[PDB]
Amino acid sequence: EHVILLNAQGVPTGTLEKYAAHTADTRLHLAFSSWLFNAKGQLLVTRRALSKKAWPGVWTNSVCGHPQLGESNEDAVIRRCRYELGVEITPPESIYPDFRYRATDPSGIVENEVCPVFAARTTSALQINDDEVMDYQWCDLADVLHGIDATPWAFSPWMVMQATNREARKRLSAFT
Ligand SMILES: CN(C)CCOP(=O)(O)OP(=O)(O)O
Ligand SMILES: [Mg+2]
Ligand SMILES: [Mn+2]
């Protein structure tokens, strides 16, 4: 696996091996986030495994990852859902296409990402890959946005920043 590197204008400049790309000074690169919802409209919140290099053991939105050369964002969403969660989904929908953030984890690993955000509904049962996910919960969207506004440090920085965008929050609601 790799990440697709980008310049300040969002123009691909090459690739780097995924694990090696995330450091104390992570170069800007291509990622996605997806918010997964069940038939009942409940959001899937996941706790990343303790083995993840960046933000291990951290509560976060359903599935995030890094698109590869030649892959659309939406196919990246699909592949990681199957890979991390064992689960089929409806076509991912755009929720926040221009999200970009940079952040430092407790051990000082930076994420530096142009990170389009998607939403989808699950269409099969989860089958959890515990190399990726250590814990999950189905819940009410509004409950999660209240935890986020009250205790942001309890969640991943990209989750909080995503959910705190006025329009992104309004689209996630409408989605449910
Ligand atoms: C929002 N960022 C973190 C994009 C995806 O992050 P992960 O750390 O889940 O990446 P991957 O599943 O590719 O290891
Ligand atoms: Mg992931
Ligand atoms: Mn990254």
UniProtKB/Swiss-Prot annotation:
Its cofactor is Mg(2+); Mn(2+). The record marks Y101 as: Essential for catalytic activity. Its EC number is 5.3.3.2. Residues 27-161 form the Nudix hydrolase domain. Keywords: Cytoplasm, Isomerase, Isoprene biosynthesis, Magnesium, Manganese, Metal-binding. PROSITE patterns: NUDIX. Pathway: Isoprenoid biosynthesis; dimethylallyl diphosphate biosynthesis; dimethylallyl diphosphate from isopentenyl diphosphate: step 1/1. InterPro entries: Idi_bact, IsopentenylPP_isomerase_typ1, NUDIX_hydrolase-like_dom_sf, NUDIX_hydrolase_dom. Mn(2+) binds at H22, H29, H66, E111, E113. Pfam families: NUDIX. The active site is at C64, E113. Changing Y101A: Reduces activity by 99%. CDD domains: NUDIX_IPP_Isomerase. GO terms for cellular component: cytoplasm. It comes from the Bacteria. Substrate binds at K18, R48, K52, H66, R80, E84. GO terms for molecular function: isopentenyl-diphosphate delta-isomerase activity; magnesium ion binding; zinc ion binding. Binds 1 Mg(2+) ion per subunit. The magnesium ion binds only when substrate is bound. It is an enzyme of class 5 (isomerase). GO terms for biological process: dimethylallyl diphosphate biosynthetic process; DNA damage response; isoprenoid biosynthetic process. Belongs to the IPP isomerase type 1 family. Catalyzes the 1,3-allylic rearrangement of the homoallylic substrate isopentenyl (IPP) to its highly electrophilic allylic isomer, dimethylallyl diphosphate (DMAPP). Homodimer. This is Isopentenyl-diphosphate Delta-isomerase.
